[PDB]
Amino acid sequence: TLKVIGVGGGGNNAVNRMIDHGMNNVEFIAINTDGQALNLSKAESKIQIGNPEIGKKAAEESREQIEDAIQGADMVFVTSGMGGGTGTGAAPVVAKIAKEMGALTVGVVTRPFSFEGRKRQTQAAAGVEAMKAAVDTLIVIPNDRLLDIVDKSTPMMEAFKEADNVLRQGVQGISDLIAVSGEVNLDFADVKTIMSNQGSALMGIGVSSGENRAVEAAKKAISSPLLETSIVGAQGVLMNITGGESLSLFEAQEAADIVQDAADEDVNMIFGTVINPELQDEIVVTVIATGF
Numbered sequence: 172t173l174k175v176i177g178v179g180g181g182g183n184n185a186v187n188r189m190i191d192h193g194m195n196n197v198e199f200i201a202i203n204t205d206g207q208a209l210n211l212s213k214a215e216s217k218i219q220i221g222n223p224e225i226g227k228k229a230a231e232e233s234r235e236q237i238e239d240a241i242q243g244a245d246m247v248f249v250t251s252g253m254g255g256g257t258g259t260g261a262a263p264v265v266a267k268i269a270k271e272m273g274a275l276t277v278g279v280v281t282r283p284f285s286f287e288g289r290k291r292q293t294q295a296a297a298g299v300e301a302m303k304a305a306v307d308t309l310i311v312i313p314n315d316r317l318l319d320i321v322d323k324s325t326p327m328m329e330a331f332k333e334a335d336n337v338l339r340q341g342v343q344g345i346s347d348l349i350a351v352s353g354e355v356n357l358d359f360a361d362v363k364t365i366m367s368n369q370g371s372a373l374m375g376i377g378v379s380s381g382e383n384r385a386v387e388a389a390k391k392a393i394s395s396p397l398l399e400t401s402i403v404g405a406q407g408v409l410m411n412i413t414g415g416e417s418l419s420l421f422e423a424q425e426a427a428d429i430v431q432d433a434a435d436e437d438v439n440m441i442f443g444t445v446i447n448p449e450l451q452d453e454i455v456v457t458v459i460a461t462g463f
């Protein structure tokens with residue numbers, strides 16, 4: 172039982188992208204203060220709660236409504252945009268409740284763009300520290316590093332939809348590996364071994380389609396701009412290899428071995444594969460490195 176919880180406006184929009192893109196392994200929950208924007212959410216479960224301190228007390232006042240929604244989950248994803256009042260303060264509370272209930276809590280959050288001002292960057296920094304305390308592992312993508320990812324052509328009014336896509340890839344990276352119906356999935360106990368109480372995590376994404384797509388997508392994930400460091404400093408590595416119906420076990424093994432050779436000699440590496448047939452010839456390699 173996996174649940175991804177979008178906290179705040181930006182977090183809700185990512186969840187809505189997470190649903191438009193096929194991701195049915197998981198139960199979706201949306202939490203916000205703005206009721207109208209909650210009605211425009213696509214998640215099954217919606218919870219209205221109620222400067223990042225309003226968000227906090229709103230979440231704490233709705234502790235039991237949040238507790239009820241998460242009930243039964245084994246792992247929970249809390250995705251939010253840090254910076255605003257709602258997500259920055261409420262998302263650490265939703266995470267801390269999830270971790271108290273025994274769920275493996277994974278935070279996938281964003282730092283705002285530089286063009287959003289220092290105050291929004293200052294509050295986001297405090298939210299990030301709050302979330303690190305709350306979750307098992309936290310993935311933080313600074314929105315500024317999408318400029319090292321997006322096209323020269325990217326419109327400025329499209330900028331927050333690429334943020335949605337990156338948060339989609341963070342959650343779907345791990346979520347697709349654990350409970351899809353086509354079961355060459357991994358074992359949950361081993362996932363816990365890589366995520367539990369670790370803290371700060373890196374994410375690498377690589378896409379390719381050639382004859383040597385496996386080697387190419389793995390090298391590009393190893394050196395994805397989203398990684399702030401090389402994964403060599405990492406103790407545990409969770410790797411996802413998503414392909415179409417032509418994805419081979421050899422290709423997965425090849426890509427896993429390339430990543431494992433870049434990690435620390437005695438990393439704890441677990442990897443799995445996901446067949447999604449909308450993808451034709453391109454494979455996507457997602458690497459999650461933990462413990463920093």
Ligand SMILES: Nc1nc2c(ncn2[C@@H]2O[C@H](COP(=O)(O)OP(=O)(O)OP(=O)(O)O)[C@@H](O)[C@H]2O)c(=O)[nH]1
Pocket residue numbers: 178179180181182184185204222251252253254255256257258259281282283284287291314331332333334335336338
């Ligand atoms: N991925 C994504 N991020 C967004 C989006 N909109 C804003 N963000 C980022 O997330 C940060 C917080 O924005 P919101 O989530 O809308 O703020 P909030 O949580 O609703 O808090 P409030 O101020 O009470 O509305 C902003 O600084 C942006 O950097 C979005 O649509 N998608």
